[PDB]
Design a protein around this ligand. Structure first.
Ligand code: KRS
Ligand code: KRS
Ligand code: LYS
Ligand code: LYS
Ligand code: CL
Ligand code: NA
Ligand code: NA
Lengths: 517, 517
C-alpha cells in the first residue's frame, strides 16, 4: 500500500494540524501577497552596505517579504537560525523570542511564538517571512524575522539531500524530491527552458514562422518507427500518434508559407535507454528555395548560437559521461563535413569503392558483431549504411555533418544533382557518438516521390516484421499542387539539451521520463 | 481511388514534363539562391520613388530576385503580365519577348522564351523571378522579368473559386488548397502564430518559466473527460494521453519552481463540433503565493495585451458568427466579474437562495429541456450549476469572470476563505457564450484533497458509464511534501484564437482538424 501513511514522521506531522487549527491558524492559507523573490533580494542588497544584527533589531535596515521552504533549522535558546529555499535561491533567517511573531498566534495563546516555531513548524514547511535584512560578520545575508506566516504544513520530511542509486531511480518519478534536493537538477532544467527560448529566438530572427500540426493522424510517416495507436470514439476510428513532423509541414510549404517550423512532441513506440524516450521533442524546420547545403549552415549556426548564449560567448563544452572518458567538444562553425563513404574510410579504415558487393559482406562479419541475416541479402547502398553504423558512428565525437547517403536510407530526398542516383542530398549531424540532426534537399517531384513510396511499400516492406502503411495519397496530391524546392531539418531537442547540460541520460533532461511500474 | 489521375488537366500538365526536360530544363531544380520575400520587397520600395516601365527596360531601377506561385497571367502579344503569390503577398510581373530570358532555355532551342512562358508554364507553377522594379501608370508595383526560372511544375490546376459545402469541407482536409486560394485563411493562421508568440512574451515578462511535461502517462486527470488510450510496447503497458496539464505542473510547484506554464496539446476523446476538436492546445500556468483574484487580473491582462498588440492598441473586436447577429466585444480590463449565483439572478431571472431545492428542480423542469434524470436527485450545488448552464452561459457575450462555483464542480480547488464550504474559489471566464478559462485558488491541503477525490470516486461508482478511476497516489504524496499556496489557470488557446480572428468554428483555426472519413 501507500507506505508513508504509517511512517512516524507523517503521523507526527499530521497530529500538528489540529493543534495549529486549534490556535486559530490556517495551515493552508490562500496567498502571501507582495513578496519579493529571494534572488531579487540578493541582487538588490548583496553589495549594499547593510547594518549588523543590532541595526536589524532597531528596524533600521531594509524590510522585506519573501517565502520559501524551511530547509535548515537550529534552535539556540532565545534565538533560532534557519535557511529558506526559494526557487533555487537560499537566504538565512533569524528568529528571536522577543522580536518574532507568528501570524494568527494570539497573545493570550497558550504557546509562545518562539516555541510555536520550534514545536509546530518543521523542516519542509513553506513559510512567509517578513523582517529586516542584515549581514553577519562573515558576510552572510540574513533576515531578522518580524512575522513568520505558515504557508503550507508539509506532512513528510525533506528528501534525503544526497541520493543513492535506489533513491535516484525513485526520483525520476518523484521528480519534486529531486528539484527540492539538487541544485544540479534545478540548473539542468533551467538550462533546458533557456535552450528552447534560444531556439525560438534564432528561428524567428531568420523569419521562420512557428506553427502547430496534429499529433493524432490517420496516417504516419516521415521516419522509420513503430507508431503508437489509439481509438477516437467520435468517429470509431483508429488513429496514429505522429512519429515526426515532416508531412504536415511540407503541406504548409505547398500552402505558400516559405519558412515554417514546429517544436513538438513526437512518439516512437520503441525501446527505452540513455538516448531514447518514446515521447520526445523535435524541431522540424523547412525553408523554401534552400537545399541541404543551406540547411547545413543553418543547423550549425543555430547550435553555435545556443552554445555561445549559454557559455559567455565560448563555443566549447565539457561532456563527462562517455565511456572513453571526459571530452571537450567545440561547437564552433563550420563543423566537420564528410560524405558517408569518406567517413567509412577515415574512421572505419575501409575505402568502400575499392570493394565488391560480396567483399563488403565479409568485412561486416569479420569486423563487426552484426547478425549474418542483416547483411546476407542487403543491397549495396544498405551495405554501406550498415558499415557506417558499425565502424564510424561511435567515433563521431566532435560535431560532424555526414553527407550523401544511399538512396535506400530515405524516400523523401532528392538525389545528387550531379546525376548520381544511388546517393541522396541528405545529411545527418552527429556529436558524442549520437545522431543529432537529419536534413534533406526535399523531394518535390511528385512522380518520383510516388515511385519511391511505392518501392518502399511493396519491395522493401514485404518483410514479415514491418507494419503495413498505405501510400499517403493526400501528400502526393499536395505535391501535385506544387511544393517549392526546399531544405528542411529535424533536430532531437532532448539530445541537444543533453550535450549542453552534461546529462548522462535523456532521463536527466525530462521532468518525468517513461518509467517501469 | 484518386480522381485527378484521370482528369484532362493532369494529362495536359504532366505531358509538359517531357517537353520541358527535352529542352534541358529541370522542372524540379534544387534551389533558388539569394531570394527575397515579396513582402520584404514591398516594404523597401512601395513608398519609394521608382520609375516607369521604360526606366526598367533600361535596367536603371532596383533589381530584385524573388519567387512564388503564378496565380494570374495574360499575354498581350509581345508583352505578358502576371501575378506572383508569395506567402500572403502578391506582386505583378511583366514579361517581354525581347527582354525576358528563361533559365536553361538555349538560344538554339525550338521555342522562344516568350512562347515557353505562354505554352510550357501554367497557372499554379512556382517560378523564380529576376528583374527590375517599376510602377505601372496606375501605381501598381511591378517587376520587368529579365530571367524567369521554373522552380516547380505543378501537375494540377489552381483551386477553384466557387466552393460549396463539399468543396470547403474538402479544404479542411486539403488545407494547402485552402491556403493558396483564400487570403482570409492565410491571415487567420498568420494571426494564430502571432498570438502564440504574444502569450509567451507576456508570460515570460511575468517571470513564468515555460516547461514541457509528458503527454503519455499511466494516469489521467485534472479535468472531466474520456481519455485516449494507447499501448507502450517496450513495457507491455497501457498508457493514457493527457486530458490536461494540471497535475504535472503542480508537482513542479512542489519542486520549488515558483511560476511555470506550459503550452501544449491535450486530448479529450469526446465529440466534434464548432468548439470541440479532440486534440487541442491549452496554456496552463501556476504561480506560487497567488490566489484566484491574482490569477483573474493576470488572465484579463494577458488577453488585453494580445488584443491591443493585434489591433493597433484597440481592445474591441468584431465577431460575426453568433445566432444573435454580429457583436462587438471589448476585452478591456477589468472584465465583468460576477459570482455564479449573481449571474443566475442577472441573466437567468432566478434568485437561487430565495428557493428551496425542489423549487430549483421545478425551475429546471419547466424552463429548460434537461432530461429529468439530470436534476431529479441532484444536490443543491449541482442544481445551481445546471441553472447556470441552461439559463446563463449562452448570454455571456461580453467577457465575464464567473466566480465562486459549487464545490461539486471540481475536486482540485480551495473552498471560500469566508468559510462557506459549499462553494470554491474558482472562476471561469466566458466570452461569446463559450468557456475561455478555468482557474483556481489551488487545493494544497493533502487530507482535504484525498477526501474530495474519494467523494468523487463514490459518486462515479453509481454511474455505470464511467470506469473506475484510481486516485493518483503520487500526486497526493507530492502534496504531502508540500505545495505552496498557488493560483493557476488554463485557457483554451484555440477558442481564444477563434474570438480574435472572427472564426466561426475551431476548424478554422486548426490547419488539419479532425474530419470524418
Ligand atoms: C530528430 C530526428 C533527426 C535527428 C536524430 C533524432 C534521433 C531521435 C531518435 C529517437 C527515437 C526514439 O524512439 C526515442 C527518442 O528519444 C529518439 C531521440 O531522442 O532521437 O531524430
Ligand atoms: C482550457 C480549459 C479551461 C477553459 C475552457 C476550456 C474548454 C476546452 C474544452 C474542450 C474539450 C474538448 O473535448 C475539445 C476542445 O477543443 C475543447 C476546447 O477547445 O476547450 O478548457
Ligand atoms: N522527419 C525527419 C526530420 C526531417 C528530415 C528532413 N526533411 C525525421 O524524423 O528524422
Ligand atoms: N486543468 C484545468 C485547467 C486549470 C484549472 C486551474 N488549476 C482544465 O483542464 O480545465
Ligand atoms: Cl547506492
Ligand atoms: Na420539460
Ligand atoms: Na462508474
Amino acid at each position: 500500500e501507500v507506505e508513508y501513511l504509517q511512517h512516524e514522521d507523517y503521523l507526527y506531522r499530521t497530529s500538528k494540524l489540529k493543534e495549529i487549527r486549534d490556535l486559530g491558524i490556517n495551515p493552508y492559507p490562500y496567498q502571501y501577497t507582495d513578496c519579493l523573490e529571494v534572488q531579487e533580494i540578493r541582487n538588490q542588497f548583496v553589495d549594499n552596505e547593510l547594518g549588523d544584527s543590532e541595526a536589524a533589531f532597531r528596524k533600521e535596515t531594509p524590510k522585506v517579504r519573501f517565502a520559501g521552504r524551511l530547509v535548515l533549522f537550529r534552535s539556540m535558546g532565545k534565538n533560532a537560525f534557519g535557511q529558506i529555499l526559494d526557487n533555487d535561491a537560499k537566504i538565512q533567517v533569524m528568529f528571536n523570542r522577543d522580536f518574532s511573531a507568528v501570524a494568527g498566534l494570539a497573545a493570550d495563546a497558550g504557546i509562545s511564538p518562539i516555541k510555536f516555531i520550534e514545536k509546530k513548524l518543521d523542516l519542509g514547511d513553506i513559510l512567509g517571512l517578513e523582517g529586516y535584512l542584515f549581514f553577519t560578520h562573515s558576510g552572510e545575508l540574513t533576515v531578522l524575522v518580524e512575522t513568520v506566516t505558515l504557508l503550507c504544513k508539509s506532512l513528510i520530511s525533506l528528501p534525503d539531500k544526497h541520493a543513492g542509486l535506489a533513491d535516484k531511480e525513485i526520483r525520476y518519478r518523484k521528480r519534486w524530491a529531486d528539484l527540492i534536493s539538487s541544485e544540479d537538477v534545478r540548473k539542468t532544467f533551467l538550462t533546458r527552458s533557456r535552450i528552447l527560448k534560444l531556439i525560438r529566438e534564432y528561428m524567428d530572427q531568420q523569419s521562420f514562422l512557428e506553427v502547430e500540426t496534429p499529433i493524432l493522424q490517420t496516417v504516419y510517416g516521415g521516419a522509420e518507427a513503430t507508431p503508437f495507436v489509439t481509438t477516437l470514439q467520435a468517429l470509431h476510428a483508429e488513429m496514429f500518434l505522429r512519429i515526426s513532423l515532416e508531412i504536415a509541414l511540407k503541406k504548409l510549404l505547398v500552402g505558400g508559407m516559405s519558412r515554417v517550423y514546429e517544436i513538438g512532441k513526437v512518439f516512437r513506440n520503441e525501446g527505452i535507454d540513455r538516448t531514447h524516450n518514446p515521447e520526445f521533442t523535435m524541431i522540424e524546420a523547412y525553408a523554401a528555395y534552400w537545399d541541404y547545403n543551406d540547411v547545413m549552415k543553418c543547423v550549425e549556426n543555430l547550435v553555435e548560437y545556443i552554445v555561445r548564449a549559454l557559455n559567455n560567448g565560448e563555443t566549447q563544452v565539457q561532456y563527462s559521461h562517455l565511456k572513453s572518458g571526459p571530452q571537450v567538444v567545440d561547437f564552433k562553425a563550420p563543423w566537420i563535413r564528410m560524405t558517408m563513404k569518406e567517413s567509412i574510410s577515415v574512421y572505419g579504415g575501409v575505402d568502400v569503392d575499392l570493394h565488391a558487393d560480396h567483399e563488403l559482406r565479409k568485412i561486416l562479419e569479420t569486423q563487426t558483431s552484426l547478425p549474418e541475416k542483416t547483411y546476407v541479402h542487403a543491397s549495396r547502398g544498405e551495405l554501406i549504411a550498415l558499415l557506417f553504423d558499425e565502424l564510424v558512428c561511435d567515433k563521431l565525437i566532435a560535431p560532424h555533418h555526414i553527407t550523401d547517403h544511399p538512396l535506400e536510407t530515405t524516400p523523401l530526398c532528392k538525389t545528387l544533382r550531379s546525376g548520381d542516383e544511388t546517393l541522396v542530398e541528405r545529411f545527418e549531424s552527429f556529436c558524442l557518438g549520437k545522431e543529432l540532426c537529419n536534413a534533406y534537399s526535399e523531394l518535390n517531384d511528385p512522380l518520383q516521390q510516388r515511385k519511391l513510396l511505392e518501392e518502399q511499400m511493396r519491395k522493401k516492406a514485404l518483410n514479415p516484421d514491418s507494419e503495413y502503411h498505405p501510400i499517403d495519397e493526400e501528400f502526393l496530391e499536395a505535391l501535385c499542387q506544387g511544393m517549392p524546392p526546399a531544405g528542411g531539418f529535424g533536430i532531437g531537442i532532448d539530445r541537444l539539451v543533453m550535450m549542453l547540460t552534461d546529462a548522462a541520460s535523456i532521463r536527466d533532461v525530462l521532468f518525468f521520463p517513461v518509467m517501469r511500474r
